[PDB]
């Protein structure tokens, strides 16, 4: 029953919940061994798992299509943020093995912390689809939502952010030491607003260009 | 839900079936086929050891589907 | 017997429940001694008498310190 439910939450729709491309996992089926009001409880829980499905498809299609090493870094942090949602599905069944007395409310209870992360990162994922940005100005729209105000979605975006700067030190190691360019496609060789994030000082970027250029001679 | 999870495992099982069929048609020249299937065979040698260790833990349980699929996530990605 | 030993596992489960109860209350008692106390109340006993016994015995180890 909840062996079924804790894998329905992992992503499989089933014939208790019906997947949809408007809002997934819709229950309206009545059961006399369940409470009639229980559905309402279930509905709230459904909103979590749907997003967990909608993210994973997003990771599958990428890496006009969207391409880049930034698409290998946003999706990368999207892997690590979803991991305590996996751990907390294991621990729940671990508790259910010993105590079968605990009801659906303990599930709803235990995963209350993911009703803060999922919408506030869902809007960022939607922004990255509706706009077609894939270049270096993706660091800007990730960086402005880093400030947060809800702490657990405040730190999770930090997890992704460092990765991007670690990726931006692969380009700025080939450029700055060996004078090597086009080991990644671009977002003599001029400075443009797309290839430079708009909260890094422009004078430092001029120093960067000079140091990269002088190596080849 | 059962029909979906075993389907996902089946989609991975096609990719192992094609490779094993390719290997069987060598021991049952091009001058690079043998050098390529050698590395493929070595990959299977490592991968099968990992999997048989999980089965060794089955003879000695508390392991469910959701444990081994999350464990084998970085390998089924590498398979694709 | 199989059901007679799962009851013994059940005894150990409540004994760990009383283990958490003993630490949050900061008692000196361990698990073996509390099983002795459980057998004592199987025969029937004042807890007010057992506490006087243990409230003599523990602070008669502080008299040979």
């Amino acid at each position: 029953m909840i062996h079924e439910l804790l894998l329905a939450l992992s992503g499989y729709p089933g014939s208790i919940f019906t997947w949809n491309k408007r809002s997934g996992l819709q229950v309206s089926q009545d059961f006399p061994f369940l409470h009639p009001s229980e559905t309402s409880v279930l509905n709230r829980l459904c909103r979590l798992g749907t997003d967990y499905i909608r993210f994973t498809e997003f990771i599958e299609q990428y890496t006009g299509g969207l391409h880049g090493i930034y698409l290998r870094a946003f999706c990368t942090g999207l892997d690590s943020v979803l991991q305590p949602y996996r751990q907390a599905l294991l621990d729940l069944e671990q508790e259910f093995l010993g105590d079968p007395h605990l009801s659906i409310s303990h599930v709803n209870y235990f995963l209350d912390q993911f009703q803060l992360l999922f919408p506030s990162v869902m809007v960022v994922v939607e922004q990255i689809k509706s706009q077609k940005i894939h270049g270096c100005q993706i660091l800007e729209t990730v960086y402005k939502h880093s400030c947060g105000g809800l702490p657990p979605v405040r730190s999770a975006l930090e997890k992704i952010l460092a990765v991007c700067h670690g990726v931006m030190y692969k380009q700025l190691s080939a450029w700055m030491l060996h004078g090597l360019l086009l080991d990644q496609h671009e977002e003599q060789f001029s400075l443009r607003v797309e290839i430079l994030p708009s909260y890094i000082p422009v004078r430092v970027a001029e120093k960067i260009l000079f140091v990269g250029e002088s190596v080849q001679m | 839900c059962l029909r979906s999870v075993l389907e996902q495992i089946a989609a991975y099982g096609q990719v192992v079936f094609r490779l094993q069929e390719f290997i069987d048609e060598v021991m049952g020249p091009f001058r690079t086929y043998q050098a390529f299937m050698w590395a493929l065979y070595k990959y299977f040698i490592s991968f099968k050891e990992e999997l048989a260790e999980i089965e060794k833990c089955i003879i000695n349980t508390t392991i469910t589907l959701a444990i081994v699929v999350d464990k084998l996530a970085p390998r089924l990605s590498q398979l694709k | 017997a199989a059901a007679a030993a799962a009851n013994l596992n059940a005894v150990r489960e409540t004994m760990d429940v009383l283990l958490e109860i003993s630490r949050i209350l900061n008692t000196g008692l361990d698990m073996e001694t509390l099983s002795i106390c459980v057998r004592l109340c199987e025969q029937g006993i004042n807890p007010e008498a057992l506490s006087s016994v243990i409230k003599e015995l523990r602070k008669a180890t502080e008299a040979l310190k």
């Binding site: 259910f96 093995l97 | 349980t61 | 596992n9 005894v11 004994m15 073996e32 099983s35």
Partner: peptide, 23 residues
């Protein structure tokens, strides 16, 4: 008597068809 018999190896095999306290 209790503590002498308590020290035994418990259930580590878990049932998925007998979820509630598998012997």
């Amino acid at each position: 008597l209790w503590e002498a018999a308590l020290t035994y190896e418990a259930s580590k095999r878990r049932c998925w068809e007998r979820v509630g306290c598998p012997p």
